[PDB]
Design a protein around this ligand. Structure first.
Ligand SMILES: [Zn+2]
Ligand SMILES: [Zn+2]
Lengths: 130, 138
């Protein structure tokens, strides 16, 4: 239940991302109480608009585990996920989503399209913000 | 457009044969196809590997740029919520797609992303291209 530690790692990733001129957002993917993936935004570095921290750790964890989805895993992010990441989180079958502040300009969990509450969303995680 | 959809359909049928969701897409720039792909989520253990994102990633690698301004994307099925957002981020100029997806779509269906305040860039949308074939192959 080391949530403070999980968020700290995400904050570290966020700071590092900012230093390399990326959007300062970080995330960690946890499975069975252990961090199995960590990352900040890498869209500039990879010339990939989908390389947001959330998707980066989802791809990394899936590669480490050799599975197409992450049922039972928890995702910690420094900022409310956007529309693209919210949908990816749903597709990955993430169990719990923990994030810091809301992002009114582009969020999609409690802000914006509130994807997890829409009829076109077929899977939603637990959501703990702030 | 006929050639672009022809190729997208080729990718869609191939994806189905690979036990992937039978969806295909092509990325066009200056009237030429610069990327083509079907779904690869199962092959790559990557739920983001939808045809749309695959071609955006490939085209960006081929051009060495983060965004694809002026590019058009053709896909056999209406983009989902994740892809609609990626399409926005990539600054795609025009989006052409075949069949509608009322179950998981996000363009004309569902959240109708391009009409939302949290979307900061919308492509011009054209639907119904080769709808029968696209829908026929799921
Ligand atoms: Zn995102
Ligand atoms: Zn999609």
């Amino acid at each position: 239940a080391e949530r403070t530690h999980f968020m700290e790692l995400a904050l570290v990733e966020a700071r590092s991302a900012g230093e390399r001129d990326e959007v300062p957002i970080g995330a960690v993917l946890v499975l069975d109480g252990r961090v199995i993936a960590r990352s900040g935004n890498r869209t500039r570095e990879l010339n990939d608009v989908t390389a947001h921290a959330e998707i980066a750790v989802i791809r990394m964890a899936c590669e480490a585990l050799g599975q197409e989805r992450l049922p039972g895993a928890d995702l910690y992010v420094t900022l409310e996920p956007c529309t693209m990441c919210a949908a990816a989180i749903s597709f990955a079958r993430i169990r719990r989503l923990y994030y810091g502040a809301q992002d009114p300009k582009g969020g999609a969990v409690e802000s914006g399209v509130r994807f997890f509450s829409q009829p076109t969303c077929h899977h939603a995680p637990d959501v703990y913000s702030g």
